[PDB]
Amino acid sequence: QQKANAVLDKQSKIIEVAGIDAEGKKVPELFAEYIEPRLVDFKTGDFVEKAEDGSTAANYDQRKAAKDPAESIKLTADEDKAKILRRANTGIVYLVKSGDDISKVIIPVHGNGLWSMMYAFVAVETDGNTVSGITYYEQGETPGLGGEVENPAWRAQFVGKKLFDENHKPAIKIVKGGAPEGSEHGVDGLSGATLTGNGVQGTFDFWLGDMGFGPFLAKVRDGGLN
Ligand SMILES: [Cl-]
């Protein structure tokens, strides 16, 4: 079943955003060496060993969990900034191993675009604030417009940006028509693709908030990884 090729490209994207030099090695090999998947309780931000459905980090299906009322919540329209309708109570994150230390954490985020649900990985430094990279691993927006979330030049703009402001509130901004420079939080919007851009904005506003990875990244900031 492939199914397998889907799992493998996901692993590829994780390795890609992790900034690991692939010394010719294959993806399943690099993933075992450098990646440690962990489950996270969103509300508390704590690492957990199992989800409510009994899954471990190795077999947890967060998308399926999000539609199971036993282990997810229904978001009000106002709460639902990323326009995803529901949120699993437990998330998965991918720790990047240096040696015995954790070098980065990669968090899965998503939000609705114009034509499609848009899924991305965001690589965060162990300060729990600085973005190391971003990659969209599933989206179906129009090439040349919203599809430009896959453009290397647009994604590179996220590198060095801070996720949070001084109150640890979500601070990433999709700035219509080009952010300034020396900008702490701002990246350029997608020209001609405001609706996709709004979906990206909502993605960060929700997933950096109290119902998302907010509590977790706070614990990262306070040294919860190493
Ligand atoms: Cl979710």
Residue numbers in the entry: 36 to 261
What does the paper say about this structure?
Na+-translocating NADH:quinone oxidoreductase (NQR) is a redox-driven sodium pump that generates a transmembrane difference in electrochemical Na+-potential. NQR consists of six subunits (NqrA–F) encoded by six genes of the nqr operon and has a unique amino acid sequence and set of prosthetic groups. The enzyme contains a [2Fe-2S] cluster, a FeS center, noncovalently bound flavin adenine dinucleotide (FAD) and riboflavin, as well as two covalently bound FMN residues. The NqrC subunit plays a role of an electron carrier within NQR.
The crystal structure of the holoNqrC' protein with a covalently bound FMN residue was determined and refined at 1.56 Å resolution. The central feature of the holoNqrC' protein is a twisted antiparallel β-sheet formed by six β-strands: 1, 2, 5–8. The FMN residue is covalently attached to Thr229 at the beginning of α-helix G. Analysis of Fo—Fc-maps shows clear electron density for the atoms comprising the FMN residue as well as the phosphoester bond, which covalently links FMN to Thr229 that is in a full accordance with earlier prediction. The electron density of Thr229 side chain unambiguously demonstrates its flavinylation. The isoalloxazine ring of FMN is squeezed between two loops (6–7 and 8-E with the most involved Leu149 and Leu180) and flanked by α-helix G and 310-helix E. The position of the ring is stabilized by H-bonds with Thr177 and Thr231 side chains (N5FMN-OG1Thr177,N3FMN-OG1Thr231) as well as with backbone of Gly181 and Thr177 (O4FMN-NThr177,O4FMN-NGly181). The obtained electron density of the holoNqrC' protein in the crystals clearly shows that the isoalloxazine moiety of the FMN residue adopts a bended “butterfly”-conformation with ~20° angle between the planes formed by the pyrimidine and benzene rings. This conformation of FMN most likely corresponds to the radiation-induced one-electron-reduced (semiquinone) state of the flavin, which is in accordance with relatively high stability constant for anionic radical of the FMN residue in NqrC. As shown in the current work, the isoalloxazine moiety of the FMN residue is buried in a hydrophobic cavity in such manner that its pyrimidine ring is squeezed between Leu149 and Leu180 while its benzene ring is extended from the protein surroundings.
